[PDB]
């Protein structure tokens, strides 16, 4: 009842930029740079794979299998005997050989990397189990540094405490602080979304961004509590009528001229300057696109990259995804002639 | 269903609190003996916070007002969810290789032929054979898309400026044009999408 | 899989299967919406009844509208039964007892 919003910005705290809509706008954000979207999401996905317990019971049974190597309940041996020859061609023979090398390749995987629970790649064994209690899992998460991935875990680089070295207090600490600031800002964004979902004013007044300026009257506060109760929150008269908003927007978008442009001598519309197989057949050209031109050309040049068995990490630059896979294949093909 | 008679009959304007959509869902659930139709809507109304976007919005996912406008003008925005206060938007922008059916191996192989190859639907542009980024491509199904969910703080004159209105008027101005000079109905190239261009889906939220 | 290999999906079946403003506009322009009913104290939401020729049969879908001044002209010119309702003038008196409740 005590919340009142600014009447100029309607509780937003930001107005559309006076110029350009620049040196009067805000200072953009970290996620407007489209060139770093896939790198940012790749690092975030790599961080989230530590916490992800979607495959939890499967990795738990794998952990039990590698702990006690004395299992039972087989009850039928799989037949599964057809890796026919190193000869012939096609896709079936290649896929079948790659499927039949599964046991030796899994042994290689378990020798090079081992179980994720034995190397702290995942969260470990049963630490966070649902249906236990909200608070036992909180205690287990607060135990050691289970809330952080090992790339930001302080108990991994303390052995390098002498002279700093690889910047365990300047690079790992900076990365951990940036990660914590990002998750705290995510919580702030979620609180703002929750307040916006129920028509309430947002609690966190964020700085203006690259298309916005601060409000003239608030400066960015956009609302506040007061002794006087809101008579719009009371009596339900908080939101305008749809027809009234339509009439306001129609009158605002349709200015009229009450002077004929012959008595006043005006021959041009308002503004400065005054006197003066594309874009009409196909229509424009994308502007945010253009950094993916090389990847599109390479995907057209090599149709084998469209194979369903191939899954590149993703990216647009020379470093990452299609170009990385093509460079790896070319390096392998060049170095197999010398070996 | 609507409770619009309540004020003139009793004095209490029950239409200010009645939910006609929830009544309609309850009526349909009762008629079809399918209680999930009413229960899902009731649970979405009750547990609204748990319906907030918690996937694809990780760690300060704010773009800008200006970048949101640039992405909207480039038709790179798949969904625009405007919230109840009409001042905060969630911008679902697809991952670029998930924006259309290109056959890029970064995406999950949703679409494969019998040769187990990802299906590419990149029709060449006869007006720009040297610029593959101007070529035409069918957009992916939305349910198969991977989307960044950005947070945008809209200004208080967002509806007065009419940028969303101008984008909608640009999008709904063309499509399925009859051509008497050659017969047939023609979907014009202006009505088709480019390689990374998607159809913007504007959805508003009800605070009630 | 397909249902389990997005890693970004959030209510993909609850969002969708639900008319937005652009989809309602497309359905009206295709002549698939039988009736539009404005409801609420602000009349900013409609309960659109679609025809049997619509994709998905005949169903009732709730659409929240933006301030679009061409929507009513679109509905009228596309043969849609635009039903508003009551809208009592005295908002202060009408929305008083229900706010007390």
């Amino acid at each position: 009842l005590l919340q009142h919003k600014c009447q100029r910005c309607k509780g937003a705290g930001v107005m559309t930029c006076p110029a350009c809509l620049c040196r009067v706008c805000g200072t953009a954000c970290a996620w407007d740079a489209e060139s770093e979207w896939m790198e940012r999401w790749g690092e975030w996905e790599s961080r989230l794979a530590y916490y992800d317990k979607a495959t939890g019971p499967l990795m738990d049974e794998w952990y039990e299998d590698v702990l006690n190597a004395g299992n039972l309940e087989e009850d039928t041996p799989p037949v599964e005997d057809d890796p026919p020859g190193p000869e012939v061609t096609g896709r079936w023979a290649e896929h079948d050989r790659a499927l039949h090398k599964d046991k030796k390749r899994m042994a290689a995987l378990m020798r090079r990397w081992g179980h994720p629970y034995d190397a702290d790649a995942n969260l470990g064994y049963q630490i966070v189990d649902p249906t236990a209690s909200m608070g036992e899992n909180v205690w287990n998460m607060a135990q050691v540094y289970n809330s952080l991935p090992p790339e930001l875990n302080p108990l991994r680089t303390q052995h390098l405490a002498d002279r700093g070295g690889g910047n365990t207090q300047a690079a790992v600490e900076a990365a951990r602080s940036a990660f914590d600031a990002q998750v705290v800002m995510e919580a702030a964004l979620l609180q703002n979304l929750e307040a916006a979902a129920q028509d309430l004013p947002k609690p966190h007044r964020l700085p203006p961004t690259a298309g916005t300026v601060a409000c003239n009257e608030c400066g960015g506060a956009a609302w506040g509590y007061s002794f006087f109760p809101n008579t719009a929150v009371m009596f339900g008269l908080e939101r305008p009528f749809w027809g009234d908003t339509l009439a306001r927007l129609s009158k605002y978008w349709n200015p009229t001229q009450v002077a004929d442009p012959a008595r006043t001598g005006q021959l041009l519309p308002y503004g400065e300057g005054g006197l003066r197989a594309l874009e009409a057949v196909v229509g424009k050209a994308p502007a945010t696109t253009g950094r993916y031109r090389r990847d599109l050309e390479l995907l057209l040049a090599h149709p084998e990259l469209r194979d369903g068995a191939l899954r590149v990490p993703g990216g647009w630059g020379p470093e990452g995804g299609l170009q990385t896979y093509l460079r790896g294949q070319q390096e392998e093909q060049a170095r197999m002639q010398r070996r | 269903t609507y409770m619009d008679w309540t004020y003139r009959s009793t004095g209490v304007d029950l239409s200010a609190v009645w939910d006609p959509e929830l009544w309609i869902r309850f009526r349909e659930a009762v008629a079809q003996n399918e209680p999930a139709i009413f229960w899902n809507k009731l649970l979405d109304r009750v547990q609204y916070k748990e319906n907030l976007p918690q996937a694809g919005l990780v760690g300060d996912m704010r773009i800008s007002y200006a970048k949101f406008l640039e992405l909207l003008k480039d038709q790179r925005v798949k969904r625009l969810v405007v919230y109840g206060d009409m001042r905060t938007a969630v911008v679902e922008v697809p991952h670029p290789w998930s924006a259309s059916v290109l056959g890029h191996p970064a995406t999950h192989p949703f679409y494969e032929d019998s040769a187990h190859n990802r299906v590419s639907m990149l029709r060449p542009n006869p007006a720009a054979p040297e610029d593959v980024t101007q070529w035409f491509c069918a957009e992916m199904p939305e349910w198969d898309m991977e989307k960044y969910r950005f947070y945008v703080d809209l200004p208080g004159d967002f509806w007065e400026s009419g940028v969303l209105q101008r984008h909608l008027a640009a999008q709904r101005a063309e499509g399925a044009v009859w051509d008497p000079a050659s017969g047939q109905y023609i979907l014009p190239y202006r009505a088709q999408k480019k390689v990374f261009q998607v159809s913007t889906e504007v959805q508003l939220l009800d605070p009630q | 899989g397909d249902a389990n290999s997005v890693k970004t999906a959030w209510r993909t079946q609850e969002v969708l299967r639900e008319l937005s403003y652009t989809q309602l506009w497309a359905l009206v322009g295709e002549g698939h919406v039988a009736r539009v009913r404005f409801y609420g104290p602000e009349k900013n939401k409609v309960m659109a009844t679609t025809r049997a020729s619509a994709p998905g049969g005949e169903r009732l879908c709730k659409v929240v509208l933006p301030p679009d001044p061409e929507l009513l002209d679109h509905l009228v010119s596309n043969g849609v039964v635009v039903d508003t309702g009551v809208t009592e003038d005295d908002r202060l008196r009408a929305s008083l007892l229900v706010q007390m409740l």
Partner: peptide, 20 residues
Amino acid sequence: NRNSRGQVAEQVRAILDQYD
């Protein structure tokens, strides 16, 4: 239907529970 990560976790638990 497209499951979120939590719903994928529910699926994995249901599938790894069923027969028991």
